[PDB]
Design a protein around this ligand. Structure first.
Ligand SMILES: *[C@@H]1O[C@H](CO)[C@@H](O[C@@H]2O[C@H](CO)[C@@H](O)[C@H](O)[C@H]2NC(C)=O)[C@H](O)[C@H]1NC(C)=O
Ligand SMILES: *[C@@H]1O[C@H](CO)[C@@H](O)[C@H](O)[C@H]1NC(C)=O
Ligand SMILES: *[C@@H]1O[C@H](CO)[C@@H](O)[C@H](O)[C@H]1NC(C)=O
Ligand SMILES: *[C@@H]1O[C@H](CO)[C@@H](O)[C@H](O)[C@H]1NC(C)=O
Lengths: 212, 250
């Protein structure tokens, strides 16, 4: 089952304030009107930056797993959002065939942990996410909103893990998964410095002209 | 004009430029400290036959306190002076903690021989970090053995007294740097042409209060044509405007 990624998925690329200006930038963005896969979890590739989104009312989705082999041979990222204390770890975890957590199973044999991080809690409400791995910096952009329409994405954390991440899996009824691509946009900055509109410069010749 | 006679007119000869009066350096505020609070800071040391190796990462390491501390009997560093570590950065640091005798303190060195260096903790011939040693007679003077295994005759009554030894081994290429010294901050001065350094962003100009509502995540603002027009202050989160300090032709 596929759905259209209407125009969602635009984020501030550089943590730099600008106002009342049109800025053209190149980064891994989700191209406009691309196909987004809809799932109802199996292991999925992570190739170069993955756009996530879910709508629930009871925080049913509770965590992620990131890694390369998921067989304790390498350090693997583990995110387990608790009720009030979200936990991020990087350990040589052994992952279950179908890890799930209200009883948990994925966090057994926690040995040779190389990174631990604790933060503020996350999660009729659509909760999106963006994950990118750049030069050992793992970057998460997020925003929860009350998929048609436009909304910009602010960053949350930047974890200097430096681990080679290739696949992922989600911990648990339905969710969306897109893939980023190295496409250039034109970003419109409001007087308050918030991105209001954008133009996919390779979408169509009119947008090519607008960017030019 | 390269002449001794100047005809009537207006000529441009030089340029006026105000110079900065002082430099202001500011950086992200002090955060979690490296848990140096736990090894010599500790209650009991493991024996040298089963010395401990603790990893320390993702923290700021102030070597000034330990270097100024006079409680260390020996402090031998290789490579860089102990006062420059506040500038240097590393990927990881490991602490090798054990108890030995003073006569055995000579064994902690590259390319050394002896019972310890041959049957026990042996240092590599390559780059070493820093070794710290002190006499621990008061606290540790048959519970301690050395690797076939023999016990020390630690009698509470100079080379046979217990010495506790910690070796600081530095990993400097394994990953992006996460353990570094601090960054001493300075007071900020406004309405003067100053030479500033905000969280790694450099330049000169005059700093004034600004009414630009930045977003909580951006750190510095930049006007059209890629010029820094404002930055936000660390340690006050205030948003301060930058204006080039006056110049022009003469
Ligand atoms: C960084 O640390 C300094 C102090 O170490 C903080 O400055 C304080 O700011 C509050 C304002 O809410 C003042 O009431 C205090 O008097 C300030 N302390 C000093 C010593 O001047 C600053 O807020 C910290 N900033 C961050 C981001 O942690
Ligand atoms: C939530 O779970 C984490 C580990 O999954 C734990 O460290 C934390 O203490 C928990 N918070 C509670 C029980 O409030
Ligand atoms: C544990 O992780 C470290 C970090 O990379 C690695 O060097 C080591 O080989 C791993 N295994 C053991 C037994 O230390
Ligand atoms: C910018 O923000 C201020 C305060 O939030 C608001 O009054 C103003 O209308 C905003 N500018 C816009 C929406 O163009």
């Amino acid at each position: 089952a596929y759905t259209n990624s209407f125009t969602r998925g635009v984020y501030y690329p550089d943590k730099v304030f600008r106002s009342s200006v049109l800025h053209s930038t190149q980064d891994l963005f989700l191209p406009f009107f691309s196909n987004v896969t809809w799932f109802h979890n199996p292991v999925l590739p992570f190739n170069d930056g993955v756009y996530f989104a879910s709508t629930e009312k009871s925080n049913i989705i509770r965590g992620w797993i990131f890694g390369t082999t998921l067989d304790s041979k390498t350090q693997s990222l583990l995110i387990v959002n608790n009720a009030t204390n979200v936990v991020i770890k990087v350990c040589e975890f052994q992952f279950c065939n179908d890890p799930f957590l209200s009883e948990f199973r994925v966090y057994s044999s926690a040995n040779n942990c190389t990174f631990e991080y604790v933060s503020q809690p996350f999660l009729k409400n659509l909760r999106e996410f963006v994950f990118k791995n750049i030069d050992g910096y793992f970057k998460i952009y997020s925003k929860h909103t009350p998929p048609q329409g436009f909304s910009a994405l602010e960053p949350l954390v930047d974890l200097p893990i430096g681990i080679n991440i290739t696949r992922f899996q989600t911990l648990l009824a339905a969710y969306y998964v897109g893939y980023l691509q190295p496409r250039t946009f034109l970003l419109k900055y409001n007087e308050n410095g918030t991105i209001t509109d954008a133009v996919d410069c390779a979408l169509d010749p009119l947008s090519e002209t607008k960017c030019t | 004009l390269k002449s001794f006679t100047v005809e009537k007119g207006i000529y441009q000869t030089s340029n006026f430029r105000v110079q900065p009066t002082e430099s202001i350096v500011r950086f992200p505020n002090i955060t979690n400290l490296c848990p140096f609070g736990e090894v010599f800071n500790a209650t009991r040391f493991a024996s040298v036959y089963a010395w401990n190796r603790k990893r320390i990462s993702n923290c700021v390491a102030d070597y000034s306190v330990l270097y100024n501390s006079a409680s260390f009997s020996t402090f031998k560093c290789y490579g860089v002076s102990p006062t420059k570590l506040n500038d240097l950065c590393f990927t990881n640091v490991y602490a090798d903690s054990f108890v030995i005798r003073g006569d055995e303190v000579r064994q902690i060195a590259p390319g050394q021989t002896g019972k310890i260096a041959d049957y026990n903790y042996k240092l590599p011939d390559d780059f070493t970090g820093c070794v710290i040693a002190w006499n621990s007679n008061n606290l540790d003077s048959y519970n301690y053995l050395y690797r076939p295994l023999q016990s020390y005759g630690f009698q509470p009554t100079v080379g046979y007294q217990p010495y506790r030894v910690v070796v600081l081994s530095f990993e400097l290429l394994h990953a992006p740097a996460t353990v570094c010294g601090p960054k001493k901050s300075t007071n900020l001065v406004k309405n003067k042409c100053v030479n500033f350094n905000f969280n790694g962003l450099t330049g000169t100009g005059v700093l004034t209060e600004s009414n630009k509502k930045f977003l909580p995540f951006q750190q510095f603002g930049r006007d059209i044509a890629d010029t820094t027009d404002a930055v936000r202050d660390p340690q006050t989160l205030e948003i301060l405007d930058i204006t080039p300090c006056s110049f022009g032709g003469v």
